[PDB]
Design a protein around this ligand. Sequence first.
Ligand code: MEF
Ligand code: MEF
Ligand code: TMP
Ligand code: TMP
Lengths: 264, 264
Amino acid sequence: MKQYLELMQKVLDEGTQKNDRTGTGTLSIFGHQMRFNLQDGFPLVTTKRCHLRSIIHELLWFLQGDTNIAYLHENNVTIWDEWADENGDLGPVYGKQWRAWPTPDGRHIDQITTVLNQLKNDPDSRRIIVSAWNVGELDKMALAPSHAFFQFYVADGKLSCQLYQRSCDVFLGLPFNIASYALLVHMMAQQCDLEVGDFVWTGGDTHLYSNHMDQTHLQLSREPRPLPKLIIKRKPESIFDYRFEDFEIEGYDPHPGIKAPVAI
Amino acid sequence: MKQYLELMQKVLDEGTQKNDRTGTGTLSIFGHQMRFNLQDGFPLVTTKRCHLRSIIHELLWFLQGDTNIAYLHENNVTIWDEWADENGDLGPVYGKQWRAWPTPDGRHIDQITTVLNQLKNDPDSRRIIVSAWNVGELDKMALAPSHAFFQFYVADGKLSCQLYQRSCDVFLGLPFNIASYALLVHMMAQQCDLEVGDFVWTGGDTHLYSNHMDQTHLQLSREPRPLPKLIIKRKPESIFDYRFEDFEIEGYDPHPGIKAPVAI
Ligand SMILES: Nc1nc2c(c(=O)[nH]1)N1CN(c3ccc(C(=O)N[C@@H](CCC(=O)O)C(=O)O)cc3)C[C@H]1CN2
Ligand SMILES: Nc1nc2c(c(=O)[nH]1)N1CN(c3ccc(C(=O)N[C@@H](CCC(=O)O)C(=O)O)cc3)C[C@H]1CN2
Ligand SMILES: Cc1cn([C@H]2C[C@H](O)[C@H](COP(=O)(O)O)O2)c(=O)[nH]c1=O
Ligand SMILES: Cc1cn([C@H]2C[C@H](O)[C@H](COP(=O)(O)O)O2)c(=O)[nH]c1=O
C-alpha cells in the first residue's frame, strides 16, 4: 500500500543504526503516523502475500481472553510459538488484559465490554480506551505489549480508532497489525450500527531489522494493487461470537509472499 | 509557535461539531502529530503569555507523587481547584500512577525510577514507558488521564520522548502540556548525561471548545516570536530534587495573555 511503502522508504533514508534486545540490529526512526480511510478499502498489503488465516485467528484469540497457544495450533497458526513456555503459555499478554485486567482489590475488568457499553450509551466520550500496558504484570509477560494502547472515536455516524504501537517491526509485524485492527474496527462498527471511518496508526520505535534489507528492496520495487473489500456475512449476537467463516476478503490479488527471519 | 497555530487552523477548517462531557460543545478532529526539535528552542507558546509558574509547579508536583492540591496552593497555583473534593484530593491521578502504581499483589511500582534505570543501563530498549492509564483505578480519579502514555527513545546520544494525549483542549491545555513534557525531557537528559532530541506530540480527540472561538481568532492574527532558551542552573542529585529556582527561561517575550473559561 502507498502509505506502507512510503514508511519503508523513510526508514531506509532517515533511519539510524541501533542495537536491539534481540542482538540483530535495526534501522530505526521514532514517531510516525499514518491514516487509512476504511471506506476506501480493507488495508491489507498487496505488495506481498499476507497470511489471512493467521491474522484473523490471532484477533479472535485476543477477543476470547486466551494467552495459551493451543487455540492457535488447533487452527494451524504458529506465529507465537517462539515465545511460549513448555505448556504453551505466554503469560498475561494482550487477550488477558483486554478481557480480564486484574485490579489491586481483586476484580477483573473486561475492557472490551466496557468499550461496547460506552459506544452504545456515550459515543461522544473521549475516554473510549483499551490498554494492554498493565505495569503490574509486565514482568510475567513473554513479550511486553507492542500494540499497547488504543482509542475509539465517533463522529458523524462513523467509528474511528487510533492505535499507539511503541515498537514496530516494519516488515513482518506491521502488515499484520494494520489488518488486525482494521478488522476490529469493522466488527465493532457492525455491533454498534456505525459506519467505518479512519484507522490511525501511530508508532514509537519504528524499525527495519538488518536481516530484512534484501526483502525490503524487493518489495519496494513492486507496484501496489487495488485494495480488497471486507465482507462480514453474518451479524453475530455479540463481539465474542465471530467465527473465521464470517469474513470474506474479496478481490485480494497480491504479489508473491517474501520470507524473512523473525527476530526472537 | 508555527506547529501550534497550524493545528488551531486545521481544527477550525476540518473540525466537526461534537457534544462533550462538559455540555460546552467542541470542534474536534481525531489524530494528529507534531514534532519539536528541542535543540531549536524551548517550545513555549509566544502568541499568548503562558503562566510558567503553574507549568513548572504542576510538573514538580507530579514527580513527588502528590495528588492533593495543598502543594499547589502553597505555591499560588490554582489550576486544579475545580476538580478537587472538600479535602483537596483528586484521587490517584498522574503523580500517584507515575510514582506508586499499585499492583494486584500489593506492591507499588515507581515508573520514574524504572525509566531512570532503563536509560542508564539499557538505553536502546524499546520499552521505556510511563503510563498513567491504570484501568483498575480509573473510577477513583477526578478526571481520567489526558496525557496518558509516554515513551522515551535514545539515538546518537540524544533523548527523545513521545506523548499520547487522548484528549486535548487545544487553547488552554495544549500550551501547558507541550512545555511540561519538554521540561521533563530536559530534566531526564541532564540526569542521564544525554543531549535533548525531539518531543513528539500525538493526540486523539483534539478539540477547540465552542466558547474559545473569539480567543482563537485573536491568537491566529498574531505572529510567533523567537523561542526562548531553557537554562537549568544546577544538577541536582536526582530527578526528584529539582526546585522552581533551578530553571531559567531566557528571552521569553510573548504577546499578551488571553483569558478563556475552563470547561469543567
Ligand atoms: N520481531 C518480531 N517478533 C514478534 C512479532 C513481530 O512482528 N516481530 N510478532 C507479530 N506477530 C507475528 C509473528 C510472526 C509473523 C511471521 O513470521 N509472518 C510471516 C509468516 C506467516 C505465517 O507463518 O503464517 C510472514 O508474514 O511472512 C508475523 C507476525 C506475533 C509476534 C511475535 N513476535
Ligand atoms: N477543560 C479542561 N480541563 C482541564 C484542563 C484543561 O486544559 N482543559 N487542565 C489542564 N490543566 C490546566 C488547567 C487550567 C488552565 C488555565 O486555566 N490556564 C489559564 C490561566 C492561567 C493561571 O491561572 O495560572 C491560561 O493559560 O490562561 C491551564 C491548564 C489542569 C487541567 C484541569 N482540567
Ligand atoms: C507482537 C508484536 C511484536 N512486534 C515486534 C516489534 C519489535 O520488533 C517486537 C518485540 O521487541 P521489543 O519488545 O524489544 O520491542 O516485535 C510487532 O511489530 N508487532 C507485534 O504484533
Ligand atoms: C488535565 C488535562 C486536561 N485536558 C483536557 C482535555 C479535555 O478538554 C479534558 C477533560 O475532559 P475529558 O476527560 O472528557 O476528555 O481536559 C488537557 O487538554 N490537558 C490536560 O493536562
